[PDB]
Design an enzyme around this catalytic site. Structure first.
Site, short mmCIF file in Angstrom:
data_model
loop_
_atom_site.label_atom_id
_atom_site.label_comp_id
_atom_site.label_asym_id
_atom_site.label_seq_id
_atom_site.Cartn_x
_atom_site.Cartn_y
_atom_site.Cartn_z
N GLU A 11 0.84 -1.18 0.00
CA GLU A 11 0.00 0.00 0.00
C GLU A 11 0.87 1.23 0.00
OE1 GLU A 11 -3.32 0.78 1.89
OE2 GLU A 11 -4.26 -1.20 1.42
N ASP A 20 -7.43 9.83 -1.29
CA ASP A 20 -7.63 8.47 -1.71
C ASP A 20 -8.59 8.30 -2.88
OD1 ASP A 20 -10.06 8.58 -0.37
OD2 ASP A 20 -9.52 6.99 1.09
N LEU A 32 -6.50 7.22 7.47
CA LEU A 32 -7.58 8.16 7.11
C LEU A 32 -7.59 9.32 8.03
CD1 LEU A 32 -11.25 7.47 5.96
CD2 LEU A 32 -10.23 9.67 6.68
N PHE A 104 -7.29 -5.20 5.52
CA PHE A 104 -6.83 -3.87 5.40
C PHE A 104 -7.51 -3.24 4.21
CE2 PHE A 104 -3.55 -1.16 7.40
CZ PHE A 104 -3.45 -1.74 8.66
N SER A 117 -13.90 -20.01 0.76
CA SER A 117 -12.50 -19.66 0.83
C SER A 117 -11.99 -19.78 2.27
CB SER A 117 -12.33 -18.24 0.32
OG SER A 117 -11.08 -18.09 -0.32
#
EC number: 3.2.1.17
Length: 164
Positions: A11, A20, A32, A104, A117
């Site tokens: 990131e 963003d 943020l 995240f 999954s």
């Protein structure tokens, strides 16, 4: 390797207030600052954030600190989640790192999405799930990182991120 490192890579660390994909003021590795359309407001949560006259910028370290706060926040939610919890207690540190990354990247709800999954992650079926994760949109939308996160579930080693 460790999660910070793994996210700096996934990131990237930005040391200055930036906007963003959603156009909200952000800093470091996705911190943020605020949803109000306002710079000075950013710049101030920023200052209360780490605490000082940063004036729209922080240290590699400082950034490092927030991330921590962040990572915690995340895990917290993660525990705080019916669907995820069981999967993470069962996971292993590194594959946990993996689950954080996703969390995240797409929030609990999201991750919480990957049903069959997650089941396989649970039954420690490292192939089964790897392919199944390669199957989702997340993969098409973010090929690489997604390639990497998946290899880290697959093997459960940082190989995919590199080394010394």
């Amino acid at each position: 390797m460790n999660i910070f490192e793994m996210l700096r890579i996934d990131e990237g660390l930005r040391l200055k207030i930036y906007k963003d994909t959603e156009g909200y003021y952000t800093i470091g590795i996705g911190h943020l600052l605020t949803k109000s359309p306002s710079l000075n407001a950013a710049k101030s949560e920023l200052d209360k954030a780490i605490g000082r006259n940063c004036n729209g910028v922080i240290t590699k370290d400082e950034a490092e600190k927030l991330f921590n706060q962040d990572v915690d926040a995340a895990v917290r939610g993660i525990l705080r989640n019916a669907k995820l919890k069981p999967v993470y207690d069962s996971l292993d540190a590194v594959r946990r790192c993996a689950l954080i990354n996703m969390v995240f990247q797409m929030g609990e709800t999201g991750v919480a999405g990957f049903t069959n999954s997650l089941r396989m992650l649970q039954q420690k079926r490292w192939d089964a799930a790897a392919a199944a994760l390669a199957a989702a949109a997340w993969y098409n939308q973010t090929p690489n990182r997604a390639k990497r996160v998946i290899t880290t579930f697959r093997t459960g080693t940082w190989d995919a991120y590199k080394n010394l």
